[PDB]
Every structure is written in structure tokens, then in C-alpha cells.
Design a binder for this molecule. Structure first.
Ligand SMILES: O=c1nc2n(C[C@H](O)[C@H](O)[C@H](O)CO)c3cc(O)ccc3cc-2c(=O)[nH]1
Ligand SMILES: [Ca+2]
Ligand SMILES: [Ca+2]
Lengths: 319, 320
């Protein structure tokens, strides 16, 4: 009936596809729907760039579930052109390191016009989703600003500087000496409309195998959201993103193992979040209070991920 | 060595090229010129659209004098795409290269820069070889008052919406210059009109291209008082197949599409009007009391023919 998933990045979007294929939602609708998919989507990477508002995780989910995503980039449109970006370069304006594709820009333009006219992000997203018809509710973790910053040592002058996550990841490639993460605005952000209720009324809550520190983690920094998870009746099942990201675990000093990431989220039995923790084939993890089972955890295609989604329901004991 | 031109539309940009060709400015420069071209540019078609500020006449002048216009289409960039517009259409609500200009312009305006300075910043890239002064740094947007067919009410529509959607489809009652009364003349505009050796009104549409410049407080007063001669060019070209058609915007204000009527619209400086001279196309006549009228070729076939057109205006004014 009702399943809620926390997501970020391309992995979160690909996980949602697996849920949809499993329950006949969205593009995979084969007859009358009998379940509802709700995604709580990271806003930590959102940024104003060139006077327009970029919501990468919401867009990636919207584009992916709607059949518009670039299969080889994982972000932005299929058949994208970059003529507006080329002309911005010809004007010599900055930032020159962030790619605003022509098709993509229409999304940013409509979004920005609505937000400046007072529409909250949740409403903008549903307005944009009417065109894409993703077959899932894409809820921004908040309608208020909550942006992940990165504290680095700047290589041009050796000075400490905070840069938005986008500049750290897209411009520096996570290649600069990096000291910590800051979730600027998280404590002052309210849980987005429907977010607490979606976590509270779910039959199960799933954590997509997205980046733990900078995709899922920032969702968990919104005060209302972490409490909903601790207080909800539904089982909470996490998927480990460690199959062998590594850069962001290092910054907060956590090992890059399914065991360490499991204890990063922690056990509901204690002060933590998880009731179950699924890890990849051949991987072993043990958390007291957390049901751990090793299963195939590679999102090869919507069919393989659907099995991944099933593995979580089975461990949660939910039908 | 100082010539000021009021301009709007594609005709205004083509006229500026002729001035540049005559005085060796911009693209037609050989060695450093000793003349200065200043354009006073209509802002009446400017609009916020899709959250960005679109300024059509300033951009047309900037792209044209900067050599960025597509020679075989005559409008817009070379190698222009319309993919963002395609997606805007799919969303149910504007060239891709064009959008870059709007993105840069809007960021500057929202950061406190006035339109005059925004224009100077964009011109560093285009280098049009002319000073492009917005008629005002305040909003003054030309609307058209229609009878709306959903409810039969008078409604003001932005001229650009009227032009594609409502023109010739519903009763059209008047023009309104929204914001004009609260607008001041743009920086350097009054001084450009006052210090010129000659002021030219390009053969743009008189009501909605030149006309709205004249609604900006201060600009009409500068025109009446300047010591420079004021020479207007008629936009009426007779001899077309089927005798052409009447200008639709002149029709809204019930003015005939003749060089005589457009001349009387601007009127004579000797009276309450604006012209010292009025050039009409060969084979055409106008007689207005106080106004020197001469028929000469008035087709902007190429910068060379436009250069001759500009030369005739200096000759009519008696300015070297
Ligand atoms: O590495 C890049 N990632 C780009 N991304 C992806 C984005 O960086 C994501 O924030 C991270 O890739 C992690 O999700 C975009 C996402 C959008 O919604 C819109 C535009 C972009 C542009 C880029 C880009 O130019 N380079
Ligand atoms: Ca707040
Ligand atoms: Ca009525």
C-alpha cells in the first residue's frame, strides 16, 4: 500500500525505479495501481546558479521516473545541448565549471519563476511533475533552505574556506584537503509538507543506497525528519552503499565498510535509525539491534533492483 | 562629430549600421574614428518572461552592430537552437543562445545594476561600436488595450503578447505606456540629445518603436529644446505589390499609413511638434508647415544604401 523512501543522487532515483517495477507504478503500470510510492528527497545540494534555482536530486528523480534522464551521465536530459552554457562562457562570466544544459534550463526557469512568486518548493515540484508524471510523490525534505557546505583548505592561498557541495564535488572533484561538512540551515528548516506524515503512515521506510554523508545524511539533519523515523510504526530498512562516497566517509572519519555505515545510521534499539541493514553479496556486518542480511545489491536494471526492494520487505516482515 | 539616433525594432538596428558605415564606426572601422554614435533605444517592448528580463530593442541593436545576427534568417544568433523553448512548451508555459543574455542581464539587475550599466557590461563582449542608451532605467512597457473575448472587458496586454496572439483578432482600443509617468530619462539620454550635432529618428514604427521613447518624461522636452537639428525618416514605403498594407499600430490610433500623416504625428518643432526635417521615399510627398520635406531613396537594402540615407539627413539639416 504505502512505502516511503529517502533518496539522493542517481542511486536514489534508480532505487525508486526498482520500487516502481516491483509494484507496477509509473512507467511500469500494468493495470489498476494498488500502492503509493513516496520519496523524501535531499535538498542539500540545491543551489542558486546564474540566477536560477538548481534542485539536482529532485530533478534527477523527476527525470528518471519520467523517462528523460541521460543514461550515461545520470543527471540532466537525454539529447541535451549546451548552447546557452557556451554563450555564458563567451560572456566570460562565472561560475564556468557548472553545466546548465539548454533543455535542463527550462526546468530551472519555471522553478525559479514560481519560487520568486512565492510558491513553495513542494508546489513547484508537483507542478513540474504534472508534465513528467513520475508515478511517485517527490517530496523535498524541506521547502526551506538547507544546503550542505564543505570546509576545505583552498589551494590558491592555503586559506580555510567553505564552499557549497557543488563546487567541492563538481569543480574540485573532492580532490582538495577537506576538513568537515556543515548543514547550513538544517536546524532552521521545517520538514516539508507531507514528509513527517509519509514517514509516519508508511508500511515501510527504506533508505536508498545513496551517499550516506551527503545524500541521505543531510535529510537526517532536518529536525522533524529524524524524529519521524524514530517515532514511526513502520520498519526502517537501510541499504549499504559500500560495494567492493569513499571521500565523504573519510572526511567524517568513518570506515568505508557496510559495518561502519550501518553503525553510522545506528540501531533504533539505541539512539539510531535502522531496524534492518542489507549489505552486498559476500559482505558481513553485525550491529546489535539490527537485522543484517547479505543479498545482491547491484542496480543493474529495474528488474534486479525490484528484487533488492523485495529483499528489504522480506527482512522487515512486511507484505 | 556627435550624432544621436532614436531607434527601435529591426529597422532601428539597420539604420544604426548605415550611420556606422558612413562614419567608419564599429564593424566598418578602418582607423580610429572621430565621430561618436549614440542610440536612444526603446524599452517599451521590454518584459519579464519566465523569470528573466528580456530587452528586445537593446539586444537587436547590440547583436546587429556586434555582427552576431544570422545573415540568412536576419534575426537571432547563428547556430541558434530552441531546445529550452521546446521544454518550456512541454511544461505548458527565446533562443538557447539568447537565454544566456537574459540570464546575465537579470543577475545584474537583481544585484542592483541599472539597465544602462547592464547594457554597458554586455557590450564589452559584443563591442557594437556605438553607445546604446536605454531610453529609461525604469520600467515603461508598451501595452495594448483590447476587448477581452472571455468576458468582454477592457484589458491591457503587453505589446509582444498583443502582436502574436490578439492582433487582428479582437477589438483594439488604445496603447498604454505602463510605468511611463513614473519613469525618468536614462543616464546620458537628455545630454546626448542636447549636445548632438544632429538628432535622427530612424524609420522605425512611429507608434510602438519611436513613439514610446517620447512617452518617457524629459525626452520630449529635450527634443523640443535642443539646438541640434531633428531629422525624421518616414517608414512608409510605397510601390509594394498590391499597394502594401496599412500599419496595424498606426491603425489602433487611427492614423493613416502615409508619409504625410506620420509626419504630422511627430509634427513640426516650429509648432508643438518635433521635426525640423522629414525625409520620405522617392516618389512620395508630404507638406507640413514649418518642416523641410525632401524625397530621396529610403530603403535600407544594405549598409551602403543606408549610409546614403544618413548622408541625406545631414544634408537636409545642413550639418557636416
Ligand atoms: O559533475 C557535474 N554534475 C552536475 N550535476 C549533478 C549534481 O552535481 C549532483 O549534485 C551530484 O552529481 C550528486 O548528486 C547537475 C545536476 C542538476 O540538477 C543540474 C545541473 C547539473 C550540472 C552538473 C555539472 O555540470 N557537472
Ligand atoms: Ca525556517
Ligand atoms: Ca462581461
Amino acid at each position: 500500500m504505502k512505502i516511503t523512501v529517502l533518496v539522493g543522487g542517481v542511486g536514489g532515483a534508480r532505487f525508486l525505479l526498482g520500487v516502481q517495477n516491483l509494484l507496477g507504478l509509473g512507467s511500469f503500470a500494468d493495470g489498476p495501481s494498488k500502492h503509493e510510492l513516496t520519496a523524501v528527497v535531499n535538498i542539500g545540494d540545491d543551489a542558486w546558479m546564474h540566477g536560477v534555482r538548481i534542485c539536482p536530486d529532485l530533478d534527477t528523480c523527476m527525470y528518471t521516473l519520467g523517462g528523460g534522464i541521460d543514461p550515461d551521465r545520470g543527471w540532466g536530459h537525454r539529447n541535451e545541448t549546451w548552447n546557452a552554457k557556451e554563450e555564458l562562457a563567451a560572456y566570460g562570466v562565472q561560475p564556468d565549471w557548472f553545466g546548465l544544459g539548454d533543455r535542463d534550463l527550462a526546468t530551472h526557469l519555471v522553478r525559479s519563476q514560481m519560487l520568486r512568486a512565492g510558491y513553495p518548493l513542494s508546489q513547484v515540484t508537483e507542478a513540474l511533475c504534472k508534465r513528467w508524471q513520475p508515478g511517485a510523490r517527490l517530496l523535498p525534505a524541506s521547502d526551506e533552505r538547507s544546503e550542505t557546505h564543505v570546509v576545505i583548505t583552498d589551494p590558491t592561498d592555503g586559506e580555510r574556506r567553505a564552499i557549497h557541495f557543488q563546487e567541492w564535488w563538481v569543480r574540485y572533484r573532492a580532490k582538495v584537503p577537506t576538513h568537515s561538512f556543515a548543514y547550513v540551515g538544517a536546524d532552521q528548516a521545517t520538514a516539508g509538507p507531507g514528509v513527517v506524515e509519509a514517514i509516519g503512515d508508511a508500511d515501510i521506510v527504506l533508505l536508498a543506497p545513496s551517499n550516506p554523508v551527503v545524500s541521505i545524511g543531510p535529510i537526517l539533519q532536518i529536525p522533524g525528519i529524524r524524529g519521524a523515523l524514530r517515532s514511526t510504526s513502520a520498519p526502517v530498512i537501510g541499504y549499504s552503499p559500500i560495494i567492493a562516497a569513499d571521500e565523504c566517509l573519510k572526511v567524517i572519519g568513518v570506515e568505508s565498510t557496510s559495518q561502519a555505515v550501518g553503525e553510522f545510521f545506528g540501531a533504533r534499539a539505541g539512539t539510531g535509525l535502522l531496524d534492518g541493514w542489507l549489505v552486498h553479496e559476500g559482505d558481513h556486518a553485525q550491529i546489535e539491534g539490527v537485522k543484517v542480511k547479505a543479498v545482491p545489491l547491484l542496480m543493474t536494471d529495474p528488474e534486479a533492483t525490484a528484487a533488492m526492494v523485495r529483499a528489504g520487505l522480506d527482512l522487515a516482515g512486511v507484505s
